[PDB]
């Protein structure tokens, strides 16, 4: 299942849910700009 | 090819401001995070702070956080950091560093611009 | 923010011999998302550094089997097997796991002869 909002996530390895992005600083999903 | 380019040096006055220039070019500027080093004669690597240039996000290390202060120019594809009220303390080395794409590591350095502070 | 002390803070090695440097950290720098973002830095006279190892010890393009990165927590080395004259400079460690990330306060390698 993907991963939402705010939950940690890997950017080389991006599971966050669709529209969201993987933040390099914090390495939790948001809001892909 | 990835540069970043900074002017060699600058000479400022003491309690005059300065505006560090990193101008990046070869990448898509908004897509990596710019990072700010301090380095002092003889002395360590500092981070200043680093900012995403799509949206501005800032994070500054503790040292630096009232001193200062870095934006960016999307038009230009250039980074800033400003100094303000500037002491002998602020001589140094001061490099701009990028992010590789994947928030791991530093890929790309700028050549560092050393300020001298002085009459 | 995160303390990263390395030491020693000057190596004197000869050359063939192993130098080992130590990075320890004030908090752990295992990230929430399971990572550990420590990176090495070298750094010559009048040069801007360059990466070595990142995520404790994952080489760089071209580094060779002899920059060894090890550790995990709070505590973490850099080993350098068969130093050769070109090694010497300011090897600085870093953590990119918890905002404002860190820089190590640099060990300087000088070599024996």
């Known amino acids: 299942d993907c991963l939402g909002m705010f939950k940690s996530c890997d950017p080389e390895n991006d599971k966050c849910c669709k529209r969201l992005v993987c933040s390099r600083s914090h390495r939790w999903c948001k809001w892909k700009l | 090819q990835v540069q970043l380019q900074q002017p060699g040096a600058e000479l400022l006055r003491p309690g005059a401001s300065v505006k560090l220039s990193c101008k990046a070019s070869?990448?898509?500027?908004?897509?990596?995070?710019m990072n700010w080093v301090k380095q002092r004669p003889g002395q360590g690597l500092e981070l200043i702070g680093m900012?995403?240039?799509?949206?501005?996000?800032?994070h500054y290390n503790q040292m630096f956080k009232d001193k200062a202060t870095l934006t960016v120019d999307k038009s230009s594809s250039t980074a800033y950091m400003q100094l303000s009220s500037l002491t002998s303390e602020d001589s140094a080395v001061y490099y701009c560093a990028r992010r590789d794409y994947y928030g791991i590591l530093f890929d790309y350095w700028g050549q560092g611009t050393t300020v001298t502070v002085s009459s | 923010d995160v303390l990263m002390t390395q030491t020693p803070l000057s190596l004197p090695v000869s050359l063939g011999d192993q130098a080992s440097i130590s990075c320890r950290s004030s908090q752990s720098i295992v990230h929430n998302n399971g990572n550990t973002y420590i990176e090495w830095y070298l750094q010559k006279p009048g040069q801007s550094p360059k990466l070595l190892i990142y995520?404790?010890?994952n080489r760089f393009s071209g580094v060779p089997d002899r920059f060894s990165g090890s550790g995990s927590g709070t505590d973490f080395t850099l080993k350098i097997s068969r130093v050769e004259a070109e090694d010497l400079g300011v090897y600085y460690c870093f953590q990119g796991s918890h905002v404002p990330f860190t820089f190590g306060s640099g060990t300087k390698l000088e070599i024996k002869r």
């Open positions: 070869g990448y898509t500027f908004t897509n990596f995070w």
């Open positions: 995520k404790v010890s």
């Open positions: 900012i995403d240039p799509s949206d501005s996000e800032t």
